[PDB]
């Protein structure tokens, strides 16, 4: 699309925990729709978010996000004391600033970046059942002047799975030739990943594009991910390669073979896909 | 040193999988002349290259290659029917583009960067079966103007050894001191590494070299890598610190105690290696 | 902040290998003082540095770095004969060099960065004993310019440990809001790990901070690392955030439930922590 605006605008959300079906738990903007991976939440640089949070479970819950700015009462820890009982209602406050030269000449890094947010108080005091059971999301800061993508899609390793789908059941993702696709890639759980994807590649950097002819970063294919790891990028689909059913998986073998994978389904103009039959 | 050319030839190459000994199978250019890791394949952005390949083994095989473009025809799974059944043949075509504005003033990204090809449908539909086998190879892409080296090596961390030869048996590489040595640097299978070169470092960016004073990329001698990761650099062979057998390992303890190790053998000008006794 | 001037010194230390409590062995600069991890070192761009070492230890010993420049003598391996005997001494010596043009006008690359010493002879040739108990330490090079930090921290995931410290212990480190705060943070032994720090974040480039508006490096606050990877960075403590317990620890979520956390202690300017009451 076109161009990330400056940002300053203070935001509200309402954001929900619920148990879902088969033991999971999700993070949801509206009661009764939380989703795995939770909702996608996008700010640019200086914009303040409050999220007026509510635990609709039998369990405390906790909402942590990296990247961000937040003082010391929105940490979403017990360690602290900013859990959030069962039944009970909090506002978590994020913040985000611009890059910037300090007094001193040094610069100031901003917020803007492929981020995420997630429980850290189911299970363990680090989270690991909620992280388990789906209590996790992707938080995009954009600064003034990026690119904006025609669509986006998360997609998480959380152990042995991606998105907490049973092995061997997706997510696929649907674009036509020519779409300028964003990916936000996050890992949770307790084992180290490689995201592939067949057919496409982008820079090692923060957007994930190079900044122009000067720009050293490694142009990748393959990435190699730990826990709590995010990344993002855009690509531009079928670019150079044509529609198909565009493979994307882990890449530890054993991995693929059990289940980690999915398709990146680019359609020619007139919807059809060559040599896809499902 | 000389610099990569602009590129944009229409290249041909012949290659073949065959088993070799002990349960292994390799890619080579020419029959009976399979290798592990398999040739390495050069290209200038814009180049086209036709891999006229010929399954020789009695399992079907493929060819997947990472980073180059490829129509879906030459995806190399089975999945989209571009394997190659025992005894057949097939045309994979690579192509690759120079980086440059499109037509809405965004950069695209070039081809250039070190890369691989490998198996993608021994033993299960990921090629786990092959990769372990041996079924693996380089693939460097470079940009007009790179910098070339004297000579390039290729080394493969697949599972447990080092290009699938048995435990502390290298490979060593050989260099004088003051060549420009290239190392392409590749990882397969189900862990996780570290990759160590004692008396060298490399930058972390696209070639390995920092393009100037304005490069931020972190300089190092140790890098984590995964499975179907690549990397490359350029060294000076010697440089700052001079001749002798300057080992490489993954830095992984068990995996260096079990064998996980290399020399990069650098030379005096008269040839000679100091205190340098292979037991 | 104070900024590294341009190196070229010559100096020298002594550093002793020695045994510590618990069958713990650590390098030291002053006998009776070794430490885990041994003693910082931090060196400018040019600046050369002689060891003069000595192991105190009934095992051979060495001292292996990494990043910096030293012949095959200073290597610290047995193949090459640069390890130390029981009760032996020996001149270690490392080199720095800025970056530069060489002669053919291609960049040579300086010493610059976040790097660190460990022993390579110890329980194998890869020193996997000498490093489970204890022998690493960091070094820092600096170039021309770089900024000076108030105080550096050194944080080492050795195996399932921080710093060979027993599970839950930390350390914690303290610093008042606005500090200008180095990490170095070192990797070693058989797992690999992530580095996570809540509510501070850094660029993933050679210093940890941003040259300026055209530097596409990654902000992150996370981290994957694997066994003698190092890296660093510097923060302002509690910028943008304010004073409480921030907690550091590696995110493997076993790991973190079993104890490979931390806090950096950031006080308010009146000297107080907010919302930090630990038990008696
Ligand atoms: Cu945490
Ligand atoms: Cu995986
Ligand atoms: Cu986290
Ligand atoms: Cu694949
Ligand atoms: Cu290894
Ligand atoms: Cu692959
Ligand atoms: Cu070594
Ligand atoms: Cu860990
Ligand atoms: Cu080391
Ligand atoms: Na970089």
Same mark, same amino acid.
Not at 89 to 101: L, M, Q, V
Not at 119 to 144: A, F, Q, S, W
């Given at each position: 699309?076109?161009?990330?605006?400056?940002?300053?605008?203070?935001?509200?959300?309402?954001?929900?925990?619920?148990?879902?079906?088969?033991?999971?738990?999700?993070?949801?903007?509206?009661?009764?729709?939380?989703?795995?991976?939770?909702?996608?939440?996008?700010?640019?640089?200086?914009?303040?978010?409050?999220? #007026?949070?509510?635990?609709?479970?039998? $369990?405390?819950?906790?909402?942590?996000? /990296? &990247?961000?700015? @937040?003082?010391?009462?929105?940490?979403?820890?017990?360690?602290?004391?900013?859990?959030?009982?069962?039944?009970?209602?909090?506002?978590?406050?994020?913040?985000?600033?611009?890059?910037?030269?300090?007094?001193?000449?040094?610069?100031?890094?901003?917020?803007?970046?492929?981020?995420?947010?997630?429980?850290?108080?189911?299970?363990?005091?680090?989270?690991?059942?909620?992280?388990?059971?789906?209590?996790?999301?992707?938080?995009?800061?954009?600064?003034?002047?990026?690119?904006?993508?025609?669509?986006?899609?998360?997609?998480?390793?959380?152990?042995?799975?991606?998105?907490?789908?049973?092995?061997?059941?997706?997510?696929?993702? #649907?674009?036509?030739?020519?779409?300028? $696709?964003?990916?936000?890639?996050?890992? /949770? &759980?307790?084992? @180290?990943?490689?995201?592939?994807?067949?057919?496409?590649?982008?820079?090692?950097?923060?957007?994930?594009?190079?900044?122009?002819?000067?720009?050293?970063?490694?142009?990748?294919?393959?990435?190699?991910?730990?826990?709590?790891?995010?990344?993002?990028?855009?690509?531009?689909?079928?670019?150079?390669?044509?529609?198909?059913?565009?493979?994307?998986?882990?890449?530890?073998?054993?991995?693929?073979?059990?289940?980690?994978?999915?398709?990146?389904?680019?359609?020619?103009?007139?919807?059809?896909?060559?040599?896809?039959?499902?």
């Amino acid at each position: 699309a076109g161009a990330a605006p400056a940002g300053g605008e203070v935001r509200r959300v309402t954001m929900y925990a619920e148990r879902l079906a088969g033991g999971q738990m999700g993070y949801g903007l509206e009661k009764g729709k939380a989703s795995i991976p939770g909702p996608l939440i996008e700010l640019n640089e200086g914009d303040t978010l409050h999220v #007026e949070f509510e635990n609709t479970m039998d $369990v405390p819950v906790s909402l942590h996000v /990296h &990247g961000l700015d @937040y003082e010391i009462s929105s940490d979403g820890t017990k360690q602290n004391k900013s859990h959030v009982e069962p039944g009970g209602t909090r506002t978590y406050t994020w913040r985000t600033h611009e890059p910037g030269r300090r007094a001193d000449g040094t610069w100031r890094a901003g917020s803007a970046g492929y981020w995420h947010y997630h429980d850290h108080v189911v299970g363990t005091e680090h989270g690991t059942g909620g992280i388990r059971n789906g209590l996790y999301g992707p938080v995009i800061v954009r600064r003034k002047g990026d690119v904006l993508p025609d669509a986006t899609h998360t997609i998480v390793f959380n152990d042995m799975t991606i998105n907490n789908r049973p092995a061997h059941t997706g997510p696929n993702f #649907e674009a036509t030739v020519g779409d300028r $696709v964003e990916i936000v890639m996050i890992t /949770h &759980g307790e084992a @180290y990943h490689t995201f592939h994807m067949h057919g496409h590649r982008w820079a090692d950097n923060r957007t994930g594009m190079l900044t122009g002819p000067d720009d050293p970063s490694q142009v990748i294919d393959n990435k190699i991910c730990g826990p709590a790891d995010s990344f993002g990028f855009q690509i531009i689909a079928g670019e150079g390669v044509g529609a198909g059913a565009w493979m994307y998986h882990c890449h530890v073998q054993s991995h693929s073979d059990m289940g980690m994978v999915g398709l990146f389904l680019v359609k020619k103009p007139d919807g059809t896909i060559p040599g896809y039959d499902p």
